[PDB]
Amino acid sequence: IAMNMEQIERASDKIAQGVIIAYRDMQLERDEMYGYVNIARNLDGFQQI
Amino acid sequence: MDVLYSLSKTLKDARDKIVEGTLYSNVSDLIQQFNQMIITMNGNEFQTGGIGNLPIRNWNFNFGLLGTTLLNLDANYVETARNTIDYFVDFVDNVCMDEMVRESQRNGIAPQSDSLRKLSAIKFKRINFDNSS
Amino acid sequence: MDVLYSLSKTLKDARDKIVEGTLYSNVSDLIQQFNQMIITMNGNEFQTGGIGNLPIRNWNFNFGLLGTTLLNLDANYVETARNTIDYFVDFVDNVCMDEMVRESQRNGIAPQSDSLRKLSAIKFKRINFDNSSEYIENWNLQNRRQRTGFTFHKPNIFPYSASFTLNRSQPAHDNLMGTMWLNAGSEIQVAGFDYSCAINAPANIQQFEHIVPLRRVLTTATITLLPDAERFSFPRVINSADGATTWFFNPVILRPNNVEVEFLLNGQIINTYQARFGTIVARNFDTIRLSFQLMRPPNMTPAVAVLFPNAQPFEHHATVGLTLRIESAVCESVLADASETLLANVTSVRQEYAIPVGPVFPPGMNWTDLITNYSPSREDNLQRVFTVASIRSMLIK
Amino acid sequence: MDVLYSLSKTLKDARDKIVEGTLYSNVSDLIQQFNQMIITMNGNEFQTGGIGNLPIRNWNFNFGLLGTTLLNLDANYVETARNTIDYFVDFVDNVCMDEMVRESQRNGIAPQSDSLRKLSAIKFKRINFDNSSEYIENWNLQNRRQRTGFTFHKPNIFPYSASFTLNRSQPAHDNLMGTMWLNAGSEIQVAGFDYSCAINAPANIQQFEHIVPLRRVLTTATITLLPDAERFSFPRVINSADGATTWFFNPVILRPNNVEVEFLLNGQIINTYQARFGTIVARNFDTIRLSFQLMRPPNMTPAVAVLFPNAQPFEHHATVGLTLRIESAVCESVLADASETLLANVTSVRQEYAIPVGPVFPPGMNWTDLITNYSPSREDNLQRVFTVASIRSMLIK
Amino acid sequence: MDVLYSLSKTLKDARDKIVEGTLYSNVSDLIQQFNQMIITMNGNEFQTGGIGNLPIRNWNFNFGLLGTTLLNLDANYVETARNTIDYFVDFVDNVCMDEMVRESQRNGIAPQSDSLRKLSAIKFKRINFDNSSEYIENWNLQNRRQRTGFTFHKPNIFPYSASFTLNRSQPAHDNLMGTMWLNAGSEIQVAGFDYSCAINAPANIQQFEHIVPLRRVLTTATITLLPDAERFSFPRVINSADGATTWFFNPVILRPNNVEVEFLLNGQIINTYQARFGTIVARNFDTIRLSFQLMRPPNMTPAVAVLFPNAQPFEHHATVGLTLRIESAVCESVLADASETLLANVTSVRQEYAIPVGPVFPPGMNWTDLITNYSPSREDNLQRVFTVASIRSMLIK
Amino acid sequence: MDVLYSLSKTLKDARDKIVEGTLYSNVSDLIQQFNQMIITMNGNEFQTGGIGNLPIRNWNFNFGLLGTTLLNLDANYVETARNTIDYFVDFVDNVCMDEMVRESQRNGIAPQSDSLRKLSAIKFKRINFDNSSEYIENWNLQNRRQRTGFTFHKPNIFPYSASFTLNRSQPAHDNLMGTMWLNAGSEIQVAGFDYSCAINAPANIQQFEHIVPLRRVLTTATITLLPDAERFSFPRVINSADGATTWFFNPVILRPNNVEVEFLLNGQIINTYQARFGTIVARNFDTIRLSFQLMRPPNMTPAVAVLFPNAQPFEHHATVGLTLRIESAVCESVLADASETLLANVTSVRQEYAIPVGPVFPPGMNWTDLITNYSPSREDNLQRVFTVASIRSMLIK
Ligand SMILES: [Zn+2]
C-alpha cells in the first residue's frame, strides 16, 4: 500500500495535488484527455510550499 | 553596506547561536531576524563577479522560513539551518569579493558592485541589525 | 567540549549580566538558560584530577532554581546567584585543568578526562549555548571538516634555528663565503657574507640564497621586509661546524643587490617581490625563498678601496643582510604568538602540578621541539588543549 | 559520495540477491531499498564525461517499481530487474569514470564532476544504505575527523631511490668508504662498504648509518629484518656522483656487527632492536634508522688473510648489508600496495581516455613523484579518487 | 552449481547466525530459507563417490523443519540445528569432492558428478540463495556471456622457464653474447650479457631484447620493475644447448641503459615505459617486451679499465639485468596465485584419493604443464573445479 | 568471548547500517539487536585496566532505547545512535586492551580480565549475534573440538635460524664440505657446498640433505620451489662454529642434480617431488626434507677446467642451492603471516602500556622465541589474544 499511495492518490479525479502560481502567461497545454488544459507535469523551478 | 554587515552578523550569530540541543529562548530573537531576512531576500536575483578571473555567479533565493515551535533545537532544525546559512554565506562571500575588487575615482564611498548597489535600497532595509564592530 | 564552552559562557554572562539593581528584561533570557543548566546538572556526580599533583575532587550538584519573579534584581538574588556561580566556576576550572593536562597518541581530538567524557552525552546536550569565541567556532567548523582560520599577531611559526653555512671554507678561515641566519618567532634575519667581496666571482656578483620551509601553510600574511639584518652586522667569533675551532667575522655592510623574495606553495611561485622593501603581502605560502646577491661596487672612494684588496688579508669582510618579520597571519592550524596567552596557560597548568612527560608533547612543553616536529596527532592534541585553555581563560582570569 | 557507494552497494546486492527461484524473504529488505532508489532517481537527468576522450553521455531515469508480490522470484522479475540494474550500473560506471578523472588544487575532498555534485543534495539522501567497505568507512570517519586506518600488505611507502654515499673517496676510486641503498616499494636494502676493511679505523670498527624518513606515519607494522643485502653483494661498475667516471665494486660480505634498528617518531625512539633479525614489529614510526657497523675479523684463516692486506691494492672490498621489508602496515593516509588494484584502476581510466595533465597529480600518474612530494591537497585528491575507484571496483570487475 | 553454492551459503550462515541466545529477528530470514531447503531436499536420495579411492556414500534426507516460535534461540534449537547442519555439511563436502575429481574433454563447464547433475533440476531451484562470492559471481556472469575479472595477488601466469640464448657463441665459450632469463610465478628476471662489453659493437652499444608472450590477457596490472636482476649476477657454470659441455659465467654488472618496457596487446603498443623504474602500471596486455641495452662506459677509472681489455681473455663479463614482478592483476580466466588456496585444495583432493590421470588435466596436476598449454577446454574444467573448490573452502576450512 | 564479538559486530554494523536517510527496513533487524544489547547492558558496572600503565576505567551503562518509529532515519536518530555507539566502542576497546594484555599458564583459553569474566555469564548471553569472522568461527569450532583451519598468506612457521654445518672440515678451512641454510618467515634457502667439487667422492657425486621439522602441521600448502639459492651464492667470510676464527667462501654455482623434496608427516612420505621446480603442492606435512646432490660436470670447457684442479688450492668452491617459499597454507593452530596485522596489534598494546614480562609469552613478544618453543599453553594464550585482537581490529581501525 505504501509504494502505491501515489498511483492511487494521483488517479483520483476528486483532488488535485497543488497549484503553480506563476504570474506570467504560461501557455495552456494541449492534452488528449481534456483538450486545452492548464495541467502541470512537474513542480520544478518554483517554490513547493 | 549596512545591510551587508547585517547579513553577515546574522549569519555569524546563526552559526553560533543555532546549535543542537540549545534552548529556544536563547535564540528566540535571532530566528525572527533570520526569518525577516529570508522574507526580504526571497524573489530577488543577484549577479556577482565579472572582473578579472572572478567568475560570474547568479544568485536566486527561494527558501522556506525556519520553525518557531521547538523548546530545545533538535538536529533537523540545525541541519536545515546549516543549509540556508551555507547558501547565504556563499552569497555574501561572493558579494564581498565583488566589492573589495572594485574602485572609483569619482565617489569611492559609494557601492561599486551591482549586488551592493541593489542591496542599498529600502526594500532591503528591514534586513538591518546591530552595527557593533 | 561544546557543553564545556556553554557552561563557561553562561557563567561568564551570569557574572556579567546578573548584577544588583539591573532590570529583569536584560537578564530574562539568561536566567532560563542558567535554570536549564541547573536542571540538567542536578543528580550527577563528577570526579576531577588524579594525575601528577592535581588533587582528586568529587563534585555533587544539588541546587535550587533561580527566581523569575523580580522586576529589578535585588541583592538576595545576586548573593544566591554568586554562590551557585562560584561553585560551578570551581567545577569548570577543575574540569579544564583536568583536560589540559591529559593527551593521547591515538585520537587526541576526543575528550580524555572522565568529566569531559561524561559531559559528552546527549543528556548534557541541553546545556548548549552560543559558540561565539574564535576557538570554539573553529572547533565546530573542523568538527564538520570545513575551512578554518586562526588570526595570529606575530605567530611563532619558526623554530629557533641559529646556524650558518660555509659555501667556501678552509681550515685557515680567512677567505670564507656563505650565509648565516636566525629564525626565531616570526622573524628571519639572514646575511650572506663573502670575504673577497666577489673579487674573483664572475661579473663581481656573488649569488646567495636562503630557503625556509614552513610546517603549516600560512594565509594572508602581512610581512615587514627590511634590508640590512642587524644581528649579523657586528664583529663576532663563531665556533666551526664540528665545534673544534673558532673563526672571526668582521663585517662591513653592503646593501642587498637584486632582492627576490618568493612565497612558494607546493613548489609553485605564488607571490614574488623584486627589490621592494617595506610592508609586503603573501597570500598563500608554506615556503619562503630569499634570493639576494652581493655586488662589488665598481666605483669606490679612497676610504673604501683600502678595505677590499686584491690579495689575501681581508680585515673587513663584505656582508649583506635581510630581515623578514611576519606581523600577522591567518593559519588553519593552531600556533602560538605574541597576542594570546594560551600556551602560557597550558604550560602553567602542566608545570604547577608536576606532570610527567607523556607520549605526545615534548618534555617541558618545548615549543621549539613542538613546532620542529609538528605531527597531526600533536596538532590535534594542541588544538584540543588550546581550546580548553581558551575556555578556562574566559572563566579564570 | 555516500549516495554513490549506496547506489553501487544496492546494485551489487541486487545482482547477488535477486536471482531466479530465490525466496522473497531473502530479498524483502533489498527490494524496498531498490524501490526507494527508483523513486528518488526518477525525473532527474544527468550528464557524464566531457574531459579528454571520455564521451558526453546524457542520463534520463524513467523506470517502474519492482513487484513486491512473489513468494519465489520467477524469471520475469529477474529479467526486468536485470534491465534496470544494467542501466543503473552503466550510469554509476560513467559517474565513477567522470569523478576519478577530475581533480582540484583548492579543495580536493569535494566532488568535482557535475553528476556527483548533483548527487550531493538531500533530495538524493534517501538513496543512502550501509557503508561497510573499508574506504567508505574511512571516508565517513574522516568526514567527522576521527582516527582512521588503512591496512596495507607491502605498502608502497618508499619512493624509488637507488643511490649511494662516499664517506671516503678520491679520484682514483681504489680506497672508498660509505653506504649504498635501494629504497623500493616496501623494501630497504642497504650496504655499507669499506675497501680497507677498517685496517686504520679505531678499534678496527667502522660505523655505518642510514636514516630513511617516511612521508606518512605508519602504525603497527610487521617488518622482516634480514642481514646480508643481496643486491649489493656482487661485483659491479658504478658511475660517479657527477656522472663523469665509473668505479669498480668487488664485494666480499661480512656479517653485520652490532645492528641497531630504531623506529623514530618526531625524533623520539619508539622501538629499538639490537642484533635481532627475523620478524620485528614497529608500533608507531615515521623514520627508520639503521645503524650497523663493520668490524675487521681479528682471527683469519690463510684463505681470508690474503684478501685484506695492510697496503693499498684491495681487490676484495669489505661489504656489510641489511634488508628491511615492511610486510603489512596500518597507515592513516591512502597509499598503494601489492594487494589492492585501485591505483591501477585510476591510471587505467586516466590513460585510456587520453587525459591532460592537471594541476595536482604528476604527469602519467608517476607514483614515485606522487609519494616523493605527498602534499595534503594531493593526499585529499588521492583519497577521493581511490574511494571512487573502490566503488567502481565493486560494480565493474 | 548455483544450488550447491546456495546450500553451502545457507550452511555457513546457519553455523554463523543460529547460535545460543541470539534474537529471533536476527535469524528470521535465514530459518525460512533453511526450511525451504529442508522441504526441497526431503524425499531425494543421492550417491557420491566412485572414482579412485573416494568411497561410495548414499545420502537420504528425512528431516523435520526448524521451529519458528522462539524469541531468543535456546540450546535445544541450537542442538537440533547443529545435527541437521552437520549432516548437510557432510553431504555437500562429499558432493564437492565428487565434483572436483571429475573432468570432461567435451563440455567441461557442465556438471560431471551424478549428484550435481541431479541438483541441476528446477525441482532444486528453490534452494537458491544469494550469489555473493567472487567465483560464483563470475560463474553467473560467464553463464550469460558478460565480462568478468578475477583479482589475483601475484598470479602464476608464467610457466617455469629457466633457459638462455646465445646470440654469439663458439665451442671455446670464451666470447659469448646473449640473454638469460627466469620466468617463474609472477616474476621475470632477465639478463643480457656480452663478454667483450661491446668493444667491437657499433657505437659501443649492444642491444638486447626479451619478449614474453602470455597465455591469457591480463588487465590493470601493478608491476614492480627494478633493474639489476639478482639471480644472474654471480658466477656460475652452465650446461650448453645440447647439454654436451659446460661454460663459465663470471659477471660484473653494468646498469641497464635505455630500458624500454612495452606491453603489447595483439601486437599493438598499449603501454610503454622508457627508463622508468619502481612501480609501473599496465592496463591491458598479453605480451611483455623488455628492450634494454649494454653501453660500454666511455670513462673508466684504473680499477675498471683492467676488467675489459681489447684482446681476447675476458675474466670479467659484462652483464645487464632487469626484474619485472606482477604484484596484482585482474584476469578474465582463472589462474593460481599466492593469495588463494584453491589449486592446493584441488590437488589435495586429487592426491588424497589416488585418482587416475584423465584426458584433460596434466599428470599430478602440474601447473607448469597446465599453463604451458592452457586450452579453452582445460580453462573451462579449471574454472568449474576452482568454483567447486571455493564452495568447499567456504564450508570445509 | 562470544558476547564480546557480538558487541563489536553490532557496533560495526550500527556504524555501517544506521546512517542518515536510510530506509528503516534496511535496519529493522539491527535496531532490535541493539535494543536487546542496551536492555542487557543496563544496570551493570565494569572495571577495565590495572596492569602496567593501562589506566583503570569504570564503566556504567544507563542508556535509553532507540526509536522504532521512523520510515527514513533522520539526523536526530543518527546523532543519538552515534553517542551510544561511541560510548560502547570505547568500552569494548578498553575491554579488548584489558584482555590482550593478560595471560595465564594454567588455562589460557579462559578469560583473564575481570570485565570478560563478567561478560561470560548467561545474563549477557542474549547479547549474542552472528559469529561470521574466521577467528570467532574457529573459536566456536574449537570450543566443541572440531577441525579448524586458519588460511595464511606466507605464514611465519619458521623461526629465524641462519647457520651452517661442516661435514668435512679442518682448522685450515681450505677444503670444506657441508650445508648452509636460512630459515626465515616462510622461506628456506639452503646451499650445500664442496670445495673439491666431488673430485674424490664416489662417482663424482656428493649427496646433501637438509631436514626442517615444523612446529605445527601445515595443510594444503602452495610452495614455490626454485633452484639456486640467491643468498649463499656470493663470496663471504664466516665465523667458525666456536666463533674463534673466520673462513672464506667463494662460490661458483652448479645446478642442483637430483632434487628430491619430501613432505613428511609422522615420518611417512606424504608428497614427494623428483626434479620438479616451479609451484608445487604439499597437502599434509610437518617436516620438509630436501635431498639435492652435487655432481661434478664430466665435460668442461677450458674456462671451467681451470676452476677445479685435482690438487689442493681451490679458489672457486662448488655450491648448489635450493629455495622453498610457502606462499599460502592452512594451519590448525594460530600463526603470524604477511597478511594479517594481529600480532602487530598485540605487540603494540603490550609495548604501548609498558607491560611486565609474564609467565607464558617471551620478553618483548619475540616471535622467534615464541615459535621456537610453541607449547600448547602458549598456543591457547596466543589464540585467545589473537581472537581478541581480531575483535578490536574490527572496531578500532
Ligand atoms: Zn602477499
Residue E267: CA atoms inside 13 Å, Cβ hemisphere, count? 0
Residue C77: CA atoms inside 13 Å, Cβ hemisphere, count? 21
Phi (first) and psi of residue F219, to 5 degrees: -140, 135
Alpha helices (H) along chain E: 2-16, 30-41, 75-100, 114-119, 134-142, 302-305, 342-352, 367-372, 376-395
d(CA C351, CA C335): 20
Select from C226, E267, D86, E24 the least CA-distant residue to F130.
Answer: E24
- Counted across chains B and F, CB pairs separated by less than 8 A come out at 12
Entry resolution (Å): 3.4
Chains with ≥3 Cβ pairs under 8 A against F? B, C, D, E
Whether A47 and B62 have beta carbons less than 8 Å apart is answered as: yes
Identity at E272, one-letter amino acid code = T
Please tell me which residue of chain E has the smallest CA distance to F325: E338
CA of F337 to the centre of ligand 1 (A): 9
Coarse DSSP helix, strand, coil percentages of chain E, rounded to the nearest 5 percent: 30, 30, 40
CA of C371 to the centre of ligand 1 (A): 38
Can chain B be said to touch chain E, i.e. do they have 3 or more Cβ pairs within 8 angstroms?
A: no
User: Could you tell me which residues come within 8 angstroms of residue E268 by beta carbon, excluding any fewer than 6 positions away?
Assistant: none
- Counted across chains D and F, CB pairs separated by less than 8 A come out at 165
CA of D339 to the centre of ligand 1 (A): 7
B19 and C131 in contact by Cβ < 8 A? yes
The DSSP secondary-structure symbol of C236 reads E
Determine contact: A3 vs chain D, CB below 8 A: yes
Does an H or E element contain C226, and which?
strand C210-227
Alpha carbon of residue D274 to chain centroid: 29
Determine contact: C121 vs chain F, CB below 8 A: yes
d(CA E259, CA E210): 12
CA of F390 to the centre of ligand 1 (A): 19
Which residue has 657499433 as its cell numbers? Answer: E202
d(CA F352, CA F356): 12
Alpha carbon of residue F48 to chain centroid: 29
Whether E335 and E152 have beta carbons less than 8 Å apart is answered as: yes
C130 and B22 in contact by Cβ < 8 A? yes
User: Could you tell me which residues come within 8 angstroms of residue E140 by beta carbon, excluding any fewer than 6 positions away?
Assistant: D19, E2, E131
CA of F153 to the centre of ligand 1 (A): 6
Whether D230 and D327 have beta carbons less than 8 Å apart is answered as: no
Phi (first) and psi of residue E342, to 5 degrees: -75, -40
Can chain D be said to touch chain E, i.e. do they have 3 or more Cβ pairs within 8 angstroms?
A: yes
What residues of E are in contact with residue D352 (Cβ under 8 Å)?
Answer: 283
d(CA E264, CA E209): 14
User: Could you tell me which residues come within 8 angstroms of residue D306 by beta carbon, excluding any fewer than 6 positions away?
Assistant: none
Select from F395, F394, F332, F392 the least CA-distant residue to F141.
Answer: F332
Which residue has 530465490 as its cell numbers? Answer: D22
Determine contact: E156 vs chain F, CB below 8 A: yes
User: Could you tell me which residues come within 8 angstroms of residue E79 by beta carbon, excluding any fewer than 6 positions away?
Assistant: none
Determine contact: D65 vs chain A, CB below 8 A: yes
How many C-beta atoms surround the C-beta of residue D253 within 10 A? 25
Whether B21 and C122 have beta carbons less than 8 Å apart is answered as: yes
F281 and E347 in contact by Cβ < 8 A? yes
What residues of E are in contact with residue D16 (Cβ under 8 Å)?
Answer: 130-132, 137
d(CA F166, CA F249): 12
C-alpha cell at D286: 615515521
d(CA C234, CA C347): 36
User: Could you tell me which residues come within 8 angstroms of residue D199 by beta carbon, excluding any fewer than 6 positions away?
Assistant: D296, D308, D310
User: Could you tell me which residues come within 8 angstroms of residue D113 by beta carbon, excluding any fewer than 6 positions away?
Assistant: D48, D95, D98, D99, D102
C-alpha cell at D197: 676493511
Could you say which of C105, C114, C122 has the minimum Cβ distance to residue F83? C122
Determination approach: cryo-EM
Coarse DSSP helix, strand, coil percentages of chain C, rounded to the nearest 5 percent: 30, 30, 40
Torsion of CA C378, C383, C386, C388, to 10 degrees: -110
C-alpha cell at E162: 629457466
E203 sits in the region (left: phi over 0; alpha: psi -120 to 50; else beta) called left
Coarse DSSP helix, strand, coil percentages of chain F, rounded to the nearest 5 percent: 30, 30, 40
D2 is in an annotated binding site: no
C-alpha cell at C209: 640564497
Taking each helix axis from N to C end, the angle separating D30-41 and D75-100, rounded to the nearest 10 degrees, works out to 60
CA of F341 to the centre of ligand 1 (A): 13
CA of D221 to the centre of ligand 1 (A): 14
Determine contact: B36 vs chain C, CB below 8 A: no
CA of D327 to the centre of ligand 1 (A): 8
Whether D370 and D376 have beta carbons less than 8 Å apart is answered as: no
Rounded to a whole number, what is the distance in Å from the CA of F87 to chain C's nearest CA?
A: 9
Alpha helices (H) along chain F: 2-16, 30-41, 75-100, 114-119, 134-142, 302-305, 342-352, 367-372, 376-395
Determine contact: D340 vs chain F, CB below 8 A: no
d(CA C71, CA C65): 17
Residue C48's DSSP bridge partners are: C57
d(CA E53, CA C346): 77
C264-289 burial: b if 16+ Cβ within 10 Å, else e:
bbbeeeebebeeebeebebeebbbbb
Whether E372 and E158 have beta carbons less than 8 Å apart is answered as: no
d(CA D11, CA D85): 6
d(CA B33, CA B25): 14
C-alpha cell at C21: 539593581
Alpha carbon of residue D82 to chain centroid: 36
User: Could you tell me which residues come within 8 angstroms of residue D391 by beta carbon, excluding any fewer than 6 positions away?
Assistant: D4, D5, D8, D92, D96, D135, D136
C-alpha cell at E36: 525451504
Whether B10 and B133 have beta carbons less than 8 Å apart is answered as: no
Pairing of strands C251-253, C317-331: parallel
How many C-beta atoms surround the C-beta of residue A9 within 10 A? 10
Distance set, CA B67 to CA B34, B47, D100 (Å): 11, 29, 40
C2 is in an annotated binding site: no
Which residue has 540545525 as its cell numbers? Answer: B78
Determine contact: B25 vs chain C, CB below 8 A: yes
Radius of gyration of chain F, Cα coordinates, nearest whole angstrom = 29
Pairing of strands E317-331, E150-153: antiparallel
C-alpha cell at F102: 593478560
What residues of F are in contact with residue D33 (Cβ under 8 Å)?
Answer: 22-23, 25-26
Burial of B53 (0-12, 13-18, 19+ CB in 10 A): exposed
d(CA F19, CA C319): 65
d(CA F203, CA F209): 18
The DSSP secondary-structure symbol of E48 reads E
Residue C193's DSSP bridge partners are: C178, C319
What residues of D are in contact with residue E300 (Cβ under 8 Å)?
Answer: 237, 245-246
- The angle subtended at Cα E191 by Cα F183 and Cα D321, nearest 5°, is 40
d(CA F11, CA D317): 60
Alpha helices (H) along C219-318: 302-305
D339 and E316 in contact by Cβ < 8 A? no
Alpha helices (H) along E188-319: 302-305
Phi (first) and psi of residue E134, to 5 degrees: -70, -35
What residues of E are in contact with residue F128 (Cβ under 8 Å)?
Answer: 19-22
Helices and strands (H, E) in chain D, number of each type: 9, 15
What residues of F are in contact with residue C121 (Cβ under 8 Å)?
Answer: 83, 87
Phi (first) and psi of residue D292, to 5 degrees: -110, 160
What residues of D are in contact with residue A8 (Cβ under 8 Å)?
Answer: none
Contacts made by residues F256-259, CB under 8 angstroms, sequence distance 24+: F256/F227, F256/F228, F256/F292, F256/F293, F256/F294, F256/F320, F256/F321, F256/F322, F257/F205, F257/F292, F257/F293, F257/F294, F257/F295, F257/F320, F258/F291, F258/F292, F258/F293, F258/F295, F259/F227, F259/F290, F259/F291, F259/F292, F259/F322
Q: Which of F20, F73, F76 to mutate to test the interface with B (most CBs of B within 10 A)?
A: F76
Burial of C348 (0-12, 13-18, 19+ CB in 10 A): middle
Is E381 strand, coil or helix? helix
Select from C119, D28, D1, C302 the least CA-distant residue to D14.
Answer: D28
Rounded to a whole number, what is the distance in Å from the CA of C115 to chain B's nearest CA?
A: 19
Rounded to a whole number, what is the distance in Å from the CA of A45 to chain D's nearest CA?
A: 13
Whether B43 and B61 have beta carbons less than 8 Å apart is answered as: yes
Residue D246's DSSP bridge partners are: D239, E300
Distance set, CA C127 to CA B74, C114, D211 (Å): 13, 18, 52
Greatest alpha-carbon pair distance for chain A in Å reads 39
Whether C83 and C14 have beta carbons less than 8 Å apart is answered as: no
User: Could you tell me which residues come within 8 angstroms of residue F330 by beta carbon, excluding any fewer than 6 positions away?
Assistant: E341, E344, E397, F149, F150, F151, F152, F218, F219, F220, F221
User: Could you tell me which residues come within 8 angstroms of residue D264 by beta carbon, excluding any fewer than 6 positions away?
Assistant: D270, D285, D286, D287, D288, D289
Rounded to a whole number, what is the distance in Å from the CA of B23 to chain F's nearest CA?
A: 16
Determine contact: B9 vs chain C, CB below 8 A: no
Chains with ≥3 Cβ pairs under 8 A against B? A, C, F
d(CA F172, CA D304): 11
D39 and A3 in contact by Cβ < 8 A? yes
